[PDB]
């Protein structure tokens, strides 16, 4: 009854960040240090705990949120950060209890001529609240003129595509990200270490 982390980390396709995927993980055994004992992860930063302790701790639930961003935006997947991703796409709380894991996926998510299938929200009226997901597709009214669902002057389509080409600079190459949040309710804990 090992936690199905291979389903999330070793998934063929990843979600666009604006529609980030969330998988619940419950009633399982979580040997965390299969990860972290992996040099494949260019980012592995835990905030509420440190992961070698997590094989000794139990949680009610663990949420795995997965998506794809570009390199220089990995810094935004952290509490108290600003930028397009942190403000409009995926927001972590300041009291974040969990881990952020990320790796370079240039060989999978880039294509000759450019992969344009991964999207991010470029415009929004307000910032997201922590763990809020906005998959709306309303034309963004930048000026005083209503848009009536038609993109044009001062009326922007809210989602933009990443331009992932293999020869992009590392800051513009795709990165796959999994955010594990550890939910402790006043109910029986269901996920644990060995």
């Amino acid at each position: 009854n090992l936690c199905p982390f291979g389903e999330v980390f070793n998934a063929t396709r990843f979600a666009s960040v604006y529609a980030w995927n969330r998988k619940r993980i419950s009633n399982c055994v979580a040997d965390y240090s299969v990860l972290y004992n992996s040099a494949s992860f260019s980012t592995f930063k835990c905030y509420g705990v440190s992961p070698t302790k997590l094989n000794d701790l139990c949680f009610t639930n663990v949420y795995a949120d997965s998506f794809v961003i570009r390199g220089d935006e990995v810094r935004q997947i952290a509490p108290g950060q600003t930028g397009k991703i942190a403000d409009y796409n995926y927001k972590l709380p300041d009291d974040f209890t969990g881990c952020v894991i990320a790796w370079n996926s240039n060989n999978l998510d880039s294509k000759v001529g450019g992969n344009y299938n991964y999207l991010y929200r470029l415009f929004r009226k307000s910032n997201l609240k922590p763990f809020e997901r906005d998959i709306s597709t309303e034309i963004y009214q930048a000026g005083s003129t209503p848009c009536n669902g038609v993109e044009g002057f001062n009326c922007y389509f809210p989602l933009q595509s990443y331009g992932f080409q293999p020869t992009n600079g590392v800051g513009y190459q795709p990165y796959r990200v999994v955010v594990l949040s550890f939910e402790l309710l006043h109910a029986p804990a269901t996920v644990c270490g060995p």
Partner: antibody
Amino acid sequence: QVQLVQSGAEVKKPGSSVRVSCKASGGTFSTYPISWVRQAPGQGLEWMGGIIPIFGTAKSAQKFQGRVTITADEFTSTAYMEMSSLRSEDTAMYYCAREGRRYGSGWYISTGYFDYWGQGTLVTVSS
Amino acid sequence: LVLTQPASVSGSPGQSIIVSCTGTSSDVGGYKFVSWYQQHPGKAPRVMIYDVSNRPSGVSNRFSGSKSGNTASLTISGLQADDEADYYCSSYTNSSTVVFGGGTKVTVLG
């Protein structure tokens, strides 16, 4: 650098079905409306229908409903037009046409503003 | 439904000509979504005007568009031999479809 490249011309027997493809390159595919427009030899343009891939929404002219299917493969950046029970009056040049702008969800499929076109595919219905 | 265009319009070099396109209140007269396309032989159409009078970048300012009632018009100024082509109007409809006009062949005389 958006480019629409369509599949090659062909002949099809009456009553059979045809699939025309149009691969989009060099830009976003899922968020832009794509339309199919046909032109009989020496005749005028006629809009067949359109699709917005990310919304999964489509619309065809009534004369083409039940006979024409317009689909999209977002992973290969490719739009498709399929026509069944081909008649000789279906002999035409079939064009892929991307909308020059995008629309919000719940609004239009196409308002008739086409920026990029495919090179066209000649379908000849004959025995 | 076919929007009504003149079959033929002719002018001399430097002359200004007008291609009309008449629909109904359920299409041309119901929306601002009228476009104008130029098609040379053996080529795909190319949008010259959209939303009645907006001109895309790269289109010469000799082309302009207008609309009143159920009739839209494409005015071509400073007629040149390379303007010789088929011109089609397009319109949104109250059925949420797009319909084209029958086309107008523009020829430069003289």
